[PDB]
Every structure is written in structure tokens, then in C-alpha cells.
Amino acid sequence: DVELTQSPGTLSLSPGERATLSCRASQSVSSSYLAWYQQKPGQAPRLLIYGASSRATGIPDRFSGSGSGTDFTLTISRLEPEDFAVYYCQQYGSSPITFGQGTRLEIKRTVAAPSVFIFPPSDEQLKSGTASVVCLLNNFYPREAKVQWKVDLQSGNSQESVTEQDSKDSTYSLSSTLTLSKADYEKHKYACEVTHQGLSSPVTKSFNR
Amino acid sequence: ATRLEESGAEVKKPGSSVKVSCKASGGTFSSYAISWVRQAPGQGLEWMGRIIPILGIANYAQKFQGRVTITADKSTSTAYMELSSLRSEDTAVYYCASKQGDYYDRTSYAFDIWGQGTMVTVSSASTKGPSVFPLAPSSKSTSGGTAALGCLVKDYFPEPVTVSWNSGALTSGVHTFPAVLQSSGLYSLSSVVTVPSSSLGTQTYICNVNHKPSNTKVDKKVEPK
Amino acid sequence: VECDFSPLLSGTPPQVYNFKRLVFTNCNYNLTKLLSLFSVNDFTCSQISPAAIASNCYSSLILDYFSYPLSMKSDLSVSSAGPISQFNYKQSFSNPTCLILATVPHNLTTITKPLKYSYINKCSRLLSDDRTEVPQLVNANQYSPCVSIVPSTVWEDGDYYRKQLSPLEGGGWLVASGSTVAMTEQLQMGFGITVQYGTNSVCPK
Numbered sequence A: 001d002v003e004l005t006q007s008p009g010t011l012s013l014s015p016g017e018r019a020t021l022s023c024r025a026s027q028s029v030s031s032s033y034l035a036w037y038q039q040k041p042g043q044a045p046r047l048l049i050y051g052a053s054s055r056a057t058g059i060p061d062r063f064s065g066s067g068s069g070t071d072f073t074l075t076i077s078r079l080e081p082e083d084f085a086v087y088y089c090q091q092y093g094s095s096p097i098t099f100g101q102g103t104r105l106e107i108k109r110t111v112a113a114p115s116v117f118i119f120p121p122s123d124e125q126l127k128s129g130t131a132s133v134v135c136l137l138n139n140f141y142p143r144e145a146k147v148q149w150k151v152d153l154q155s156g157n158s159q160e161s162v163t164e165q166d167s168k169d170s171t172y173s174l175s176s177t178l179t180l181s182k183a184d185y186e187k188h189k190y191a192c193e194v195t196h197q198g199l200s201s202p203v204t205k206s207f208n209r
Numbered sequence B: 001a002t003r004l005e006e007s008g009a010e011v012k013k014p015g016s017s018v019k020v021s022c023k024a025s026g027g028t029f030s031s032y033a034i035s036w037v038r039q040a041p042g043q044g045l046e047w048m049g050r051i052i053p054i055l056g057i058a059n060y061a062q063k064f065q066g067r068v069t070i071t072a073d074k075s076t077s078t079a080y081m082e083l084s085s086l087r088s089e090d091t092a093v094y095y096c097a098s099k100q101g102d103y104y105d106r107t108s109y110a111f112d113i114w115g116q117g118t119m120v121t122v123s124s125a126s127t128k129g130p131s132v133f134p135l136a137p138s139s140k141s142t143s144g145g146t147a148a149l150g151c152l153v154k155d156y157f158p159e160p161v162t163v164s165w166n167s168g169a170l171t172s173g174v175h176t177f178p179a180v181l182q183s184s185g186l187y188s189l190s191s192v193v194t195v196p197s198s199s200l201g202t203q204t205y206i207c208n209v210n211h212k213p214s215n216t217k218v219d220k221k222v223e224p225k
Numbered sequence C: 001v002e003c004d005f006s007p008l009l010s011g012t013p014p015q016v017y018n019f020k021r022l023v024f025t026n027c028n029y030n031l032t033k034l035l036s037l038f039s040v041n042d043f044t045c046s047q048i049s050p051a052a053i054a055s056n057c058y059s060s061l062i063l064d065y066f067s068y069p070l071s072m073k074s075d076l077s078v079s080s081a082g083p084i085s086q087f088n089y090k091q092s093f094s095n096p097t098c099l100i101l102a103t104v105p106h107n108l109t110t111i112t113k114p115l116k117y118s119y120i121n122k123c124s125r126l127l128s129d130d131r132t133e134v135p136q137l138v139n140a141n142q143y144s145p146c147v148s149i150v151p152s153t154v155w156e157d158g159d160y161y162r163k164q165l166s167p168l169e170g171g172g173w174l175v176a177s178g179s180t181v182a183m184t185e186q187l188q189m190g191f192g193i194t195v196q197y198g199t200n201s202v203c204p205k
Helices: C031-035 C070-076
Strands: A004-007 A010-013 A019-025 A034-039 A046-050 A063-068 A071-076 A086-091 A103-107 A115-119 A130-140 A146-150 A160-162 A172-181 A191-195 B003-006 B010-012 B018-025 B034-039 B045-051 B068-073 B078-083 B092-098 B119-122 B132-135 B146-156 B162-165 B187-196 B205-211 B216-222 C020-024 C039-046 C060-067 C097-103 C117-126 C133-135 C160-164 C173-181 C188-196
Touching: A004 A086, A010 A019, A019 A034, A019 A086, A019 A103, A034 A063, A046 A063, A071 A086, A115 A191, A115 B146, A130 A146, A130 A191, A130 B146, A130 B187, A146 A172, A172 B187, B003 B092, B010 B018, B018 B034, B018 B092, B034 B068, B045 B068, B045 B078, B078 B092, B132 B216, B146 B205, B146 B216, B162 B187, B187 B205, C039 C070, C070 C097
Parallel strands: A010 A103, B010 B119
Antiparallel strands: A004 A019, A019 A071, A034 A046, A034 A086, A063 A071, A086 A103, A115 A130, A130 A172, A146 A191, A160 A172, B003 B018, B018 B078, B034 B045, B034 B092, B068 B078, B092 B119, B132 B146, B146 B187, B162 B205, B205 B216, C020 C060, C039 C097, C060 C188, C097 C188, C117 C133, C117 C173, C160 C173
């Protein structure tokens, strides 16, 4: 199909600033046949622009599109807090219709280091045969975080989760879950190593069975 | 104005076929160019086909030229999408979409009418409630006179579960994490809350977990140990 | 005092459903001069002859021109159940007419090509009850009702357009769909000539 490549994957800006989202195309697309959508967690996409000059009804005039040929642009004049969402381009001049990967727009807060907490399994859970060793980074910004698990470097059994940016303090929070069975868990006695731009030295967090 | 209401979420075994519906209300129906776009979790958007009821027949993308069957019943103001020979990558939210107003040139392929969506899950694993494990607070969950505790609602199917604190009393500083998919083929999520340490002896903390699919409402007290 | 056929030679000729129409009165015409600039592929008349239409006097002469692919020559006949005469262009049956299909040679550079040929394959009215369809057949010497909701050139075969009618107009929608045809190396045009005898000032040279 036609390949639509958006950039940057994630955009960090403060309310009141000017956003510039790019959409590059593998072939030439008539600008008559390019649109832009906004999507927010848990919701259908919403049409914003369908160039070359249309704008969808009820859509703030602070979104405008430009560009031709291969490189297209969604400009957002002045960000308001509710403009922070995922943005998608779409071409519909060539079959089939293709969309883009997505640009994510999130608020650029100041730097903030996380709280690190570990939750050993529950004796509730042990009698069922499994273990779960959840670590927790809390209310940090930015989002980029490597958390490594060392007992006594462990790879292939954990997992990660992240929240949407928080509405008030615009921070993120993360949960890692280690999954052993009753047996293997009881062969050993647990740290959670966290690296982040708010920690000059990678921080560790220890608990022994 | 005109709106699109889709059919409820629905679970299907690999290899089966699903029929998602999309009913229109608030205006008319037969002139609309109704598309189907699907979206896999954490992934972008994918167009599948489209039907214009009076024009008779649908038209599909080549990828899904199997397989997908889009039809419309002008009396129900309902259109349907059907997708055969399911597969673990065919699990996604399936959106019903269209354009409002007059249609000039290719403008009916820009979508400003969307349905709520329909989550279609393909998995072998069978319909089963969760199980919540006290995620107790400790001296290691502690900084600044605050104490992080939580719950772990593990191995349920299918999505979703709603997690509440103290029947609704406690909402601030909560972080219910979004589910992950475990190697098990079943989801776990961990909900957490940040309370003052002082209250650990005076204020109890109970998580409520609703798994509407399995018919499973479960409270689970959490306290230090 | 001489009928000006020049406009035909400048620009992109419209698609058939948007045919351009030059009406002439009180002027002299050299029809061979115009046709000798093209490679005429067909030249068919109804109730007049190529020789006669080139040399009679009329009360008006009317020349339609458009982009039209030779491959569809058959569709351009009054006796065709096809979409070209149902919803696009239909010639008078109460006046003598000729129909010329021509190919634009390479020294004819002021005529330009659209991206493709295209026409209307449906122009129907959808009644306010939203279930019954009423095809709007085109009339001789008129444009399809749908010309204003169909773009200058269709972009993709099968595109679908629609316009809502006010309640005064009976509600429902006006509804149309377009077809496309691969362009040719040289532009292919149709010319429609219909002459009226009345009192006859339009004469040859």
C-alpha cells in the first residue's frame, strides 16, 4: 500500500506552545486526499483536518494542515491542555486507505524521579502454586525508564505497565510483575534496579524472603 | 444528529467467525458510506472495507479479501461486518465509521462519524474470573510518611475488570494500571494507592474488583503483614 | 462575421457529462478547417450528411466537445442502454446532428489531457423515505442533474457522491457514482454538432 511514516513518535510540549507533527509518504499523495485524526485513551478517533483546506465541523481552528508531495504537516497554533493525545494521518487517494503509526503528544513537565517499591508475593498466592513480585515506580517524569530485576539479571518472565500521563501533576507510574511458580520461587532469597534521568546513580531496592 | 451504535464485545475461538453490527439512528441510513476500521491494542488504524447500502455491494481491501463480509439491512438501519478464520493477530477494537453531510470527490473516506467500537478477542483460554491477592504495605513501600499498598487481580479473562477503593470513598493518588497479557494467555493488572502511614492501623483499605464477564465481584482487605 | 471555433483548441476538454457548448448565430463557418487539425476517427450523422452539414445554412449551429475514449464509440449511440446516453450526453432527435470522434495529434499541443476519462454510471434520486431509487435520465440538449455533485474528473472508478435536498425539494438525497477509463497516449475527443433550420444566417464560406 502507501506507507505513511509520522514523526516524532512522541512530542513533548507545554500548553501554550506551537506543535508541528510530520507525516511522510512513500509515494506522492495529492493533498486533496490527506486527513488528520485525534485519538484519546479509550475513544474512537476524531476527524480534525481533511486537507487541502477543509476542517471538520466543531474542530478548533488552531489545527491547520499544510504540505504537499511527500511531506505533510499538522500544525497546532497554541496547545491547550486537552490537545494532548495521539494524532494520526491518513491518505485516501490510493487503495487501500492507509493510516500512520501515530505521534503521541504529552506535557513537558520538569524532571521528576520515581518512588521505588517492591511487593513480595502473598502467602495467599503461594498456597495456589504461583508467585508475583511486583515492583513499582511512581509519579515520575519523563516516561523513559529501564527497570532490571536481579536475583541473587533475570530476563523473560517479568512485564511492564504504565499509566496515561496524570491529569494534575502530569507524571507517569509503572508496575513490573515477576511470575514464578511456587517451587522455583522457593529456591532463592530479590532486588529491583531502576535507571532514570532523575537518578545520577541507578537505584536499587532490596527484599529477602 | 446521526450516530452509530455497535454491538457488544464478543469473544471468539481461533478459526471461528464473528459478526459485529453497527446501527444508525438520528437521521437516515441508505446513502451513507459506512467503513470498518479496526485497531489492535497499542497499534495504529487499519481500513478494511466499506458499503453504501443503495449501491448494493461492498468493496474490500485486498489483504482482507477472504474473509470479511460487509452487508447492510436498510430496514434495521444496521450494517454488519463479518470476519472468518480468526487469528491471534485479528484481535482488536473494530470500529464502524462514516462521513456526515454531502459527499464530494473522495471526501466520504474521511471519517467524522464513529461508533463506540467493539473489542473482539481471539483466545483459546476460557471465560474465568480473576483472583485478588493482598499487595500489602511494608517498610519498603514507604517514603515521606506515605505508604503504597495495592491489589493484584490476576489471571482473568476476558477484559475488562474495574477496580475501586473503599467502595468508592478512596480515589485520590490511585493508580490502577492497565492490564498486560501474560504468557499464560490471561491478564493480570496491579492497582495501587498512596495513603498516609498514620491510617494503616486506623483506616482499613479494601479493593473492589468487578469482572462483569465472569459475574465476579470480589472485595479483598489489604493491611500490613 | 466568422464563427470562432478557436476555444476548443485551448485547455483540457471537459469530461462528457460536462460537455462544453458553443452556440453560433450570424457568422460564417469553415468546418473542414477545424476538423483538418485532428485525426478524425469517425464522422457519423443523423438526418444530414457529412457533406451537407459542411455546406448548408442554418438558424443556429451548436458544437459540443469533450474528452471521450474511442473504445466507447458504441456507447455514444441513441440506441444504447448504456450509461453514456442514460446519464451523460444525449443528442437531439428533433434536429439534424453529427457525431465526430477525433484523436489529437502531437502538433496540437494547446489541448491538454486530464488524468483519465470518466463518466457517470448512476444519477438517481433517493426519496425522502430513504428506500426507493428514481434514476434521473438526462434529456437531449441538457446536463445531468448530477453534474454539480460529480467532480470535474473522477478520481477512482466507483467513487460515490451525494447531496442532500432541502424539504422544499422533497427531501431525500441526490445520489451519483462515476466510472473511469485509462487515458490514451493522445487525447481522444468527441464533437457533437446539432444544427437548427429556421431565416438562416449561419452559412459556410
